[PDB]
Amino acid sequence: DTNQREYYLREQMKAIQKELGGEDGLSDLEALRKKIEEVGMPEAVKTKALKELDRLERMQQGSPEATVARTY
Amino acid sequence: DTNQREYYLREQMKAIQKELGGEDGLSDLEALRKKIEEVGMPEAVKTKALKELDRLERMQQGSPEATVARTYLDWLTEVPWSKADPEVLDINHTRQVLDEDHYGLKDVKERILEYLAVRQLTQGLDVRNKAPILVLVGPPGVGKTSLGRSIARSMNRKFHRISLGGVRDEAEIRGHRRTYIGAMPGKLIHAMKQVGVINPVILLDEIDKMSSDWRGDPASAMLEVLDPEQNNTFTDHYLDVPYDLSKVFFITTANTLQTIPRPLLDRMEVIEIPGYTNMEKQAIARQY
Amino acid sequence: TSLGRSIARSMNRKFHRISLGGVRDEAEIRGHRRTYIGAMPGKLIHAMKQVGVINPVILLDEIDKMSSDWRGDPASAMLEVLDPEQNNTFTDHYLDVPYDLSKVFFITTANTLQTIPRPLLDRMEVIEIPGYTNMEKQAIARQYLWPKQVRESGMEGRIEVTDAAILRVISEYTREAGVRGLERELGKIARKGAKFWLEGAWEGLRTIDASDIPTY
Amino acid sequence: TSLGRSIARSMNRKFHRISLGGVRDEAEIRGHRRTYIGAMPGKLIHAMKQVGVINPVILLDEIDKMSSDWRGDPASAMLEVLDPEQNNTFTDHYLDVPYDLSKVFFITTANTLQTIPRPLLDRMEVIEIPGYTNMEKQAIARQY
Amino acid sequence: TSLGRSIARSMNRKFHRISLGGVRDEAEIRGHRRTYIGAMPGKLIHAMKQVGVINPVILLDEIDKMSSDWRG
Amino acid sequence: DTNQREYYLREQMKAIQKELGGEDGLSDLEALRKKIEEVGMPEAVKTKALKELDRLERMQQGSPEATVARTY
Numbered sequence: 115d116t117n118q119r120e121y122y123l124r125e126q127m128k129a130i131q132k133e134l135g136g137e138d139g140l141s142d143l144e145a146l147r148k149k150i151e152e153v154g155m156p157e158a159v160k161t162k163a164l165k166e167l168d169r170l171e172r173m174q175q176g177s178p179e180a181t182v183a184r185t186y
Numbered sequence: 187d188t189n190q191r192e193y194y195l196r197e198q199m200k201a202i203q204k205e206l207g208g209e210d211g212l213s214d215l216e217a218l219r220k221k222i223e224e225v226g227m228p229e230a231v232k233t234k235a236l237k238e239l240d241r242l243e244r245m246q247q248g249s250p251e252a253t254v255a256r257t258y259l260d261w262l263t264e265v266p267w268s269k270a271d272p273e274v275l276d277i278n279h280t281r282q283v284l285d286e287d288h289y290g291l292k293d294v295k296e297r298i299l300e301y302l303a304v305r306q307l308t309q310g311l312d313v314r315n316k317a318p319i320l321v322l323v324g325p326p327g328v329g330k331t332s333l334g335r336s337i338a339r340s341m342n343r344k345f346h347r348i349s350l351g352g353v354r355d356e357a358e359i360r361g362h363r364r365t366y367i368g369a370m371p372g373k374l375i376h377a378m379k380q381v382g383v384i385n386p387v388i389l390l391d392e393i394d395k396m397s398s399d400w401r402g403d404p405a406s407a408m409l410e411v412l413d414p415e416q417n418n419t420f421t422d423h424y425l426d427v428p429y430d431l432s433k434v435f436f437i438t439t440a441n442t443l444q445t446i447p448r449p450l451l452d453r454m455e456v457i458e459i460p461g462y463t464n465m466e467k468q469a470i471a472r473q474y
Numbered sequence: 475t476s477l478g479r480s481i482a483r484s485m486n487r488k489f490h491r492i493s494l495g496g497v498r499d500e501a502e503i504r505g506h507r508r509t510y511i512g513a514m515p516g517k518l519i520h521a522m523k524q525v526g527v528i529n530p531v532i533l534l535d536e537i538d539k540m541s542s543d544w545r546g547d548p549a550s551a552m553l554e555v556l557d558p559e560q561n562n563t564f565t566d567h568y569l570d571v572p573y574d575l576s577k578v579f580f581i582t583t584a585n586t587l588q589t590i591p592r593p594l595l596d597r598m599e600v601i602e603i604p605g606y607t608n609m610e611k612q613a614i615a616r617q618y619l620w621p622k623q624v625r626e627s628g629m630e631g632r633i634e635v636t637d638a639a640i641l642r643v644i645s646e647y648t649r650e651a652g653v654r655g656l657e658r659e660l661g662k663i664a665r666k667g668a669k670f671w672l673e674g675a676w677e678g679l680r681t682i683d684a685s686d687i688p689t690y
Numbered sequence: 691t692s693l694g695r696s697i698a699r700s701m702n703r704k705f706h707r708i709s710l711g712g713v714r715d716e717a718e719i720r721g722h723r724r725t726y727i728g729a730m731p732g733k734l735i736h737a738m739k740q741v742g743v744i745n746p747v748i749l750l751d752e753i754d755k756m757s758s759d760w761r762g763d764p765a766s767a768m769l770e771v772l773d774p775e776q777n778n779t780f781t782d783h784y785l786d787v788p789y790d791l792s793k794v795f796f797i798t799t800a801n802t803l804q805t806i807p808r809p810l811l812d813r814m815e816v817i818e819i820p821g822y823t824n825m826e827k828q829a830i831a832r833q834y
Numbered sequence: 835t836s837l838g839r840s841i842a843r844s845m846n847r848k849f850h851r852i853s854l855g856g857v858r859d860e861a862e863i864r865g866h867r868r869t870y871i872g873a874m875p876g877k878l879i880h881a882m883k884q885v886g887v888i889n890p891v892i893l894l895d896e897i898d899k900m901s902s903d904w905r906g
Numbered sequence: 907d908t909n910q911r912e913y914y915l916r917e918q919m920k921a922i923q924k925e926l927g928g929e930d931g932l933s934d935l936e937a938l939r940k941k942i943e944e945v946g947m948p949e950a951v952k953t954k955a956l957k958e959l960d961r962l963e964r965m966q967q968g969s970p971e972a973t974v975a976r977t978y
């Protein structure tokens with residue numbers, strides 16, 4: 115009973131925080147997508163930018179590599 | 187209306203994590219919001235600040251990339267902003283303090299007071315912006331850091347000696363990104379916390395000691411601080427906001443000029459401190 | 475560098491400086507593996523960041539001091555910063571970015587031309603700048619150096635020097651081929667006047683004679 | 691060094707130039723082991739990688755100016771690059787495999803022969819290019 | 835160095851050549867310990883794996899050009 | 907079915923080791939709580955240690971971050 119309560123309250127609060135979030139919260143994903151789509155741009159670096167964006171879309175936090183791909 | 191409904195939401199998050207922690211369980215956010223209520227700070231700094239307040243309401247234990255938000259907000263909320271000590275630059279009051287905290291050494295005190303007078307008069311264009319920054323050279327055993335203290339208390343500022351001397355890179359003069367395992371501010375930003383004002387002095391020790399490894403040499407981020415046309419434009423990897431370092435005044439000591447990099451040699455004048463005589467040594471030994 | 479700036483504002487273009495020669499390590503233009511968060515730790519993409527436009531004017535100080543021989547040679551660490559037939563896509567041969575440099579106007583600054591790697595020397599041509607006579611030093615000190623030093627010291631019309639004083643300073647306080655050492659001496663005279671102002675101010679101007687140069 | 695480019699263009703093949711002057715280490719002929727950090731192949735595998743074929747024309751400039759101090763001896767690693775019977779199995783230290791350099795057209799230049807070490811001079815065929823008279827200099831300057 | 839391959843072809847042995855000119859790394863003879871990242875054994879164990887027989891002919895070529903006194 | 911079984915094993919074990927480790931609960935945690943107080947450690951580090959202990963008291967044991975906290 116305590117474990118099931120823990121799981122329900124845990125994802126309840128996380129869903130609350132998601133709802134308290136509009137436009138994906140701050141949502142730097144769409145911010146860097148707009149930072150791509152509004153400048154330049156050549157075509158092979160378009161593919162490189164979109165694959166680095168897709169590497170950023172899968173993992174979100176915990177590894178250094180997510181922020182590495184962000185800065186890169 | 188949206189405020190009242192988001193007040194519903196924020197109180198809900200409160201009550202739930204209160205149940206989970208066995209204590210408020212969010213005491214940290216209640217402390218840090220009251221910390222943001224402090225003196226200062228500029229609005230882009232707070233806009234960078236408010237993104238990571240609201241990320242630890244997802245996980246509390248760990249992670250190595252979530253506890254860093256707690257450490258980072260605690261480090262950000264304690265730098266001095268807009269706290270000015272009563273300055274005084276008087277050539278008949280600094281002269282008395284220098285002639286009391288030392289013996290002899292007429293010519294170096296005079297050549298310091300000249301620099302102080304031009305520090306005083308130029309309050310219009312190029313307040314020191316083309317005035318060369320001060321360095322003191324000489325053997326060991328002469329009084330050099332004691333002159334740094336004797337100047338620093340003659341302006342009621344804070345003395346806080348920062349020593350490189352054993353550097354491997356310029357990536358320790360500038361801090362490092364908080365999202366790694368290495369989350370450290372500048373040696374200079376730590377050094378900025380240790381004072382109680384926004385305009386102390388910061389002496390630099392043996393600046394003729396440089397690097398050859400961790401590829402590079404720290405003559406590239408060091409000039410970005412020592413140049414008064416650059417220090418207001420200073421940005422660190424840890425805080426990522428521009429922090430003003432223009433109002434502070436720097437003194438530097440080195441032992442030889444012949445291994446200091448040329449972009450730094452072209453920003454400074456030298457006061458060679460000669461060495462003492464036997465009656466000078468006898469007077470220093472009796473007095474101090 | 476002042477002549478490079480003169481060329482840059484003559485064309486209504488930007489100016490930016492990249493220093494070299496201090497490379498104790500060999501390959502810092504390179505472009506080696508990821509100690510940097512980015513595919514270029516070299517100076518070139520950072521300088522392309524600091525300039526906002528497509529076509530700057532870039533200087534390179536001391537391309538001839540790449541003689542270190544420490545874990546590699548910095549002289550062997552450059553061919554493709556320039557040379558606009560390969561330069562349409564930039565390369566470091568080990569960690570690079572293909573990026574256009576065919577619109578940037580390059581200048582190069584050296585001291586002694588006998589240290590450049592030989593594939594780099596035969597691509598370039600040379601301008602040689604000799605050295606100044608004492609009448610050239612006196613004219614430069616009147617027309618450019620002394621007004622700038624009395625401006626930035628905050629005196630600007632209450633102290634003056636004569637030509638005899640300039641010639642005495644050049645003959646007895648400098649030994650150099652350039653004008654960098656003369657500028658510090660004129661600055662010392664200005665700051666000496668500043669301390670004498672703040673320790674009891676006079677009226678009008680005071681011209682500094684040839685006798686007072688030891689007094690300053 | 692211009693005759694190398696004209697030879698490569700005249701035979702419809704690829705050109706690449708390696709400057710051996712001032713090379714002070716043998717770790718840039720053959721590479722390093724891949725267990726170090728750094729750890730890239732030597733200049734020959736870089737050259738063969740730029741070009742996309744197995745028979746280019748490689749120009750090795752100023753082979754009389756390699757050095758032999760504490761820093762090293764790169765002239766001892768050249769002895770297996772330029773060995774005409776044994777360069778069909780060339781191993782550097784980065785790639786552990788034998789690699790075939792028997793199809794490439796090595797052209798080398800120098801100013802004097804007295805500074806090349808004798809076991810390395812023994813592998814190479816010598817062609818002396820004389821120097822010009824004034825009539826030849828007039829003709830070159832008129833039509834080239 | 836022609837006699838090396840001629841002798842090994844004559845006695846029906848296997849053959850492998852190790853070129854020692856200019857080698858000045860001790861870890862080319864022995865290896866590194868397996869604690870390090872890209873570590874692997876020296877030239878001798880590698881040659882014995884390539885041959886595949888306990889009994890080869892190894893030609894250690896130009897053994898008087900082994901450089902000294904850099905790492906060892 | 908196998909992994910839910912192994913979860914059940916570990917939780918029945920957790921109940922029994924509640925019923926023997928301490929009369930009310932893991933008593934070595936209370937021994938740590940006394941021993942932190944007995945040694946004359948300074949006040950900042952005592953606040954640090956009591957915060958770690960209070961966080962540790964809600965972790966499940968046999969966990970790769972329970973052992974780090976208990977070793978610290």
Ligand SMILES: Nc1ncnc2c1ncn2[C@@H]1O[C@H](COP(=O)(O)OP(=O)(O)O)[C@@H](O)[C@H]1O
Nearest residue numbers: 288289290325326327328329330331332470474
């Ligand atoms: N008048 C004086 N001149 C020089 N040194 C003095 C004098 N009076 C006292 N001292 C002492 O001499 C010591 C010299 O040490 P320090 O100044 O640190 O040498 P350095 O700066 O060359 O490393 C100082 O600790 C200082 O307290």
